[PDB]
Symmetry: C4
Subunit: 376 residues, 4 copies
């Protein structure tokens, strides 16, 4: 038995690759399509990967796909749509409080991926501001009975947001909050000590956000979702990644970096459950998609744009492709669960590699005349 | 009281980020849109940030927005316009000396942001050459009574410029000078020891300048405005950043690197207070904008181009947007003043992060079909 | 004889350059067009370079040019075509097993570059899947008498592939297998210990592959073909480089990094020996070229695209240009054989240099109006 | 006198910048438009800079501007044209030997920048091959009396070239040779020990050359012209920089890196003294420009392209702009001669800085609608 008593169970497993901390302490601000994940060993099929992920300290979901509360992406409609497929939705606060109240009543007065509560009503969350008049919003939201709320802000480290956190945690102890936006560990500490139940991480790296180009704030997305998640697991706090998502690759490598759920704003935009309706320009069927920092929210500054993106049909045909993509990525990484993927990442077993710009432009399609890219 | 006697007042504040000197001693020549500023903690509102900044050793301004003396951007017109909103203007020397004399008389013979002197006449500066015949310019400018002058040159380290500095500092002791252009600390020393009252830093990185591509001189702008400002505060000397400004983000992160005022050449071009008048090409209402190093200044070499840029209306609607942008950036950085921003930068409290090209191309708008970008 | 007794034979040979391990342990994921090979000393003509390379442990070839088994590039046709010029071909498994059986019979029932066996029948290989029903494929392939098989898979480190390797190495001892795809040394170990006779290295970096952009797996190609070949020569195992080949430069520097043969998928596509036939779009005579991970192979995910590329005529006029390109590159590197090129690489004598993006965009054609690029 | 006895003459001169060896031993393959030169101190006018540079060990020139021997750029015509303005020209060997003989007779049987010999005939050089039949070329060239010859080759380190060097240095001792192409110090040593009188450095980085993209050889240009010149001054050998020249900036920073003369192939192409004549495409008056490695020189490989570039008129109006550009760059660097520029470079006094891609794209013109770029 001498071949066992040298090391014990584990084979040699040569040291090719870079672990997470030697990748994100080189100082360079890497983003999603700037590194990539090296594979490992698989001993299991694609179908049996369990993507059960946690949203906050008491709310777990069957899929990590959550949506961002903008007025051009989610309502009660894609809320009930993602609640039917395991995710969660948040209702934007860019409306009257009574409209958000009857919106959050419409979803809870309403396929094995459950995401519904103890009394089999659907989990659904919402977004609330941080000004003093927003108390009159979320008290009516509690009468409607919302379960998790998002303290949506450009800067997550205000005196106003931590005062609001102290205002709900004494009044509403069962209710849970989502602090953000944070990008660094200092404001992550300054929210977690206030009693935040989960963070939403990432500012500036949105498909709409130009606040890096306008306010010079923020940081690259992947370094943020690594370092805030690395700090947040010290206290047992999940994080939520926003922005910089264009495909099923970015969300997979995003929650492989320590995130538990990922927040999809543009890639869930222009669906059949999205607000408004379709229109046409140059014969392309597309729906407008607009952030709050654009001046079309209602001496002001603008931190966002107004634009549009082509459609992708219903989510009920779209998010099974997303979970199949997460499912295949967590296959060929080599873990049977997302929890095992983060365990292999923080354990140093799962290894990465930095990627240069030429390997980026060869990572996609190249050296051909024309092509049709259909993902499913 | 044991929780106070371990450290004293200050909390933990984890070490996420890079301070300025570990960012600008890696050797890489970073520019403005190549790094970005990580946020901190705010405990104050947006309106009460005080952007009072110093121009030279006795001239302080209510806003750090100054303009560059080209013949296609400023006259007495945008001089009185920026004097009305706290800034300063300089009159280009590409004219006859009598024309610059009656120009600088028109501005001083002329809304709480003051920028006017002890006898309530407007602060206004001008630009003067460095050849021997320019003595007959600036002595008439002193009879007109200009307060600060800019020794405008491509290379700030001449024997001619320091001889000129010795020529005004014995004749005109109350008059103050602006040396430049410098990009490195050696010529910064060789001007400060001559008695320069403030520097203007940055060559080659202008929107017009091709002298990096033609004379192989200069350096990237952000490293220049960090290192010349880091040397210049040893002697209590402000610096002025030129070039590479396209937006309100670059000027904010520019004066966050140690600059006190920033010099806006192209982003203040094509206004209602700009010289000439508008014209049309392809139905776009645009005004020509041309530097001195172009051959259209009057065996010669050319260090600039002649071109045009689309308009932005009056500055009185435009620079309130700029000060609101500076105001929001200094908010979510976490300082109540620009002086506090530079104190947090040199103290190591304010931290930065390098940014890669993929995080640059995701920092702007991406992953959508079309958009309308309106900043205010 | 004192000039000999200081060192012995070898001259000074200054230390300009970087060897392979100091290039591929900096952590950066370099690819083919991101570094380049510094020249050495030549004492021989171009014609007498011997490009004899090994495919697996008993199969050697006269040229290292092998093709990839897709249904849009190779059949029996380009199999007999590359067997006539020293290479090898593999027949794609995306057909019925009887069709692959009569395909591999058509090639062996069939100009000094030989690549034919002991009984002067042509060497020709094929590709086989990894599912349980594929036993009924490769047993009929053995009745047809195929010599080397490729266990084609997206992830080379499955329990299924090593179980298949154990299933052929006890049944068919003379038959030889090609494991893959691997990119790292760990799965290279986990295939070599099973009894793999040669690897095929590189996933994601194909001209069709978007699985880096979709599944976030893989790594850059040149680092993979360096490190898997550096591990594989410990056990005397050749490797086969796939993907990222656009020209005769990439295959030359690819097999200079430790690869013995290189697998050409797109640059051998759209030939006269390619499947289907030509068609026209915009007046350009081009043939469709499609990978297996596209959904056009037959709730599914897609790891490839369907597209087309312009033609290059017959290979019998094309691969002499490729071997002449390899021949000239191995000339001005300074080795009389590919084996000597790998000996000079692992010995540290042959040296490399990293290349930046500006030197990349000047490495090609630049600073002119228009050009005609004809390679032969 | 205590202020003198601390250091002696020299002031403090702060350590901003990077010297040459800490820039070119970081391992990165920098090229011309990837770094730039920091300014110093000037105490002199633009007109009195002396750009006297050496070609080989006995041939000095009044300007460092030499041309490359291609059949689409130089003849006797631009030979007499550059001999009139201080430079040198070489006649391409892609013709019959009698045609090159009467070409080199036409130039010597023929404005203070002299470049003419002891008996006031014009200095003019030529290019000769390396095959055995080329002896019958250069012996007739010696009867015509050429002064310097270029052993033109893709790879400067052959047994054939050093045998040729031994063949002319015993026969023709007054005649001088130009070895090349070299990019590294090893082949620089292996030519200098043979008796080479000056090198020409740089392969692959030409405007025509695709041999980096085809043969995977070569290196970036600026690192080559630094390191080969750093080795070559150990033996007192000048080097000649080819390729990667688009402007007067690249040649200035090129000979600031240790080169004495620079070889201009494309930027001297399409002149009135260039071969063939003008033609029109899309209404642009342009002349074809083609390298030898293109297949249009006469089973072959191709290392070049055939193309065209727009015209620039006569050189007698063009190279005064080039020497004025060199003259202004050597002004604001801070040296009165090119020899002083190389003395300040190797002495560590002259300092550089690496430049990133964003500072590259801001180094040129940016942030405007349209522009007219006229250099003189
Ligand atoms: N990438 C991102 O995540 C991102 C980045 C920027 C903006 N945004 C979006 O922009 C929206 C608006 O952002 P915002 O926070 O700047 O707008 P806001 O109206 O919520 O706050 C405006 C400013 O007032 C301050 N503030 C907050 N509460 C206050 C109170 N009681 N009294 C006085 N001042 C108070 C804040 O500091 C803020 O700078 C957000 O809903 C967010 O979704 C998102
Ligand atoms: N990005 C920048 O800041 C930048 C860069 C380049 C040029 N420029 C613009 O280009 C304009 C002209 O630049 P310039 O200084 O090269 O033109 P200039 O006419 O002022 O000086 C021309 C040259 O003569 C020399 N000189 C100065 N005084 C002299 C004197 N008495 N006698 C003899 N020579 C003297 C200088 O060294 C200079 O190289 C400047 O006004 C500047 O605004 C700006
Ligand atoms: N750049 C590359 O080299 C590359 C990358 C990706 C895909 N591809 C191509 O895509 C093709 C298909 O790839 P694929 O392997 O994902 O498709 P597949 O049908 O061969 O395997 C599908 C999945 O089932 C699993 N599997 C294998 N054998 C199994 C078995 N008996 N039982 C249950 N599950 C089993 C595998 O893990 C795999 O994830 C391949 O032929 C390959 O050529 C190539
Ligand atoms: N950027 C550059 O500087 C560059 C790079 C590549 C090519 N080129 C141009 O391409 C031209 C041709 O280049 P080339 O040297 O490859 O063509 P060539 O005809 O001079 O040599 C062809 C090959 O034969 C070999 N050779 C030389 N002398 C020989 C001899 N007596 N006997 C047998 N073989 C011999 C050489 O090694 C060479 O690989 C050159 O004139 C050069 O100007 C320039
Ligand atoms: O108006 C805005 N200005 C800046 N960022 C925004 C704005 N609106 C939404 N965002 C961010 O963009 C994210 C959406 O991600 P994306 O659309 O997929 O890039 C949200 O979760 C927010 O963090
Ligand atoms: O003609 C020129 N050649 C080179 N630089 C110039 C010229 N004219 C102005 N500049 C510089 O460009 C700056 C203007 O900044 P910008 O236009 O906003 O890029 C000025 O402050 C000068 O430093
Ligand atoms: O469908 C696919 N999805 C992903 N990779 C593929 C697919 N088909 C072929 N490949 C890979 O692409 C390689 C071909 O190289 P290339 O076409 O020259 O880039 C093959 O050897 C495979 O490794
Ligand atoms: O045909 C060719 N193939 C590769 N390099 C060439 C060829 N012809 C000329 N060159 C190189 O290109 C240089 C000309 O520099 P450029 O045209 O200014 O880029 C010459 O000095 C040669 O070193």
């Amino acid at each position: 038995m001498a071949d066992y008593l040298i090391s014990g169970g584990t084979s040699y497993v040569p040291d090719d690759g870079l672990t997470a901390q030697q990748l994100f302490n080189c100082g360079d601000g890497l983003t999603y399509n700037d590194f990539l994940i090296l594979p490992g060993y698989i001993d299991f099929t694609a179908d049996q990967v369990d993507l059960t992920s946690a949203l906050t300290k008491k709310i777990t979901l069957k899929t990590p796909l959550v949506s961002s509360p903008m007025d051009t992406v989610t309502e009660a409609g894609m809320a009930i749509a993602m609640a039917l497929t395991g995710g969660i939705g948040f209702i934007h606060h860019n409306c009257t409080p009574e409209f958000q109240a009857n919106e959050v009543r419409k979803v809870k007065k309403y396929y094995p991926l459950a995401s519904k509560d103890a009394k089999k009503q659907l989990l659904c969350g919402a977004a609330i501001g941080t000004h003093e008049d927003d108390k009159y919003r979320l008290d009516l939201l509690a009468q409607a009975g919302v379960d998790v709320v998002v303290l949506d802000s450009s800067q997550g480290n205000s005196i106003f947001q931590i005062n609001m956190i102290k205002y709900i945690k004494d009044k509403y102890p069962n209710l849970q909050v989502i602090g953000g936006n944070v990008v660094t560990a200092a404001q992550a500490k300054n929210l977690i000590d206030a009693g935040v139940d989960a963070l939403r991480v990432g500012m500036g790296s949105g498909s709409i956000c130009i606040t890096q180009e306008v306010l010079a704030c923020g940081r690259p997305q992947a370094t943020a979702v690594y370092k805030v998640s690395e700090y947040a697991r010290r206290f047992g706090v999940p994080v939520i990644a926003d922005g910089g998502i264009q495909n099923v690759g970015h969300i997979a490598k995003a929650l492989a970096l320590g995130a538990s759920t990922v927040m999809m704003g543009s890639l869930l935009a222009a669906t059949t459950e999205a607000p408004g309706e379709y229109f046409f320009s140059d014969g392309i069927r597309l729906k407008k998609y607009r952030g709050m920092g654009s001046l079309d929210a209602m001496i002001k500054v603008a931190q966002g744009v107004s634009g549009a993106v082509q459609d992708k049909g219903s989510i009920h045909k779209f998010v099974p492709y997303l979970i199949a993509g997460i499912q295949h990525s967590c296959q060929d990484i080599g873990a049977k669960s997302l929890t095992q993927v983060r365990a292999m990442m923080y354990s140093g077993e799962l290894k990465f590699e930095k990627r240069t710009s030429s390997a980026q432009v060869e990572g996609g399609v190249h050296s051909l005349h024309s092509y049709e890219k259909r993902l499913f």
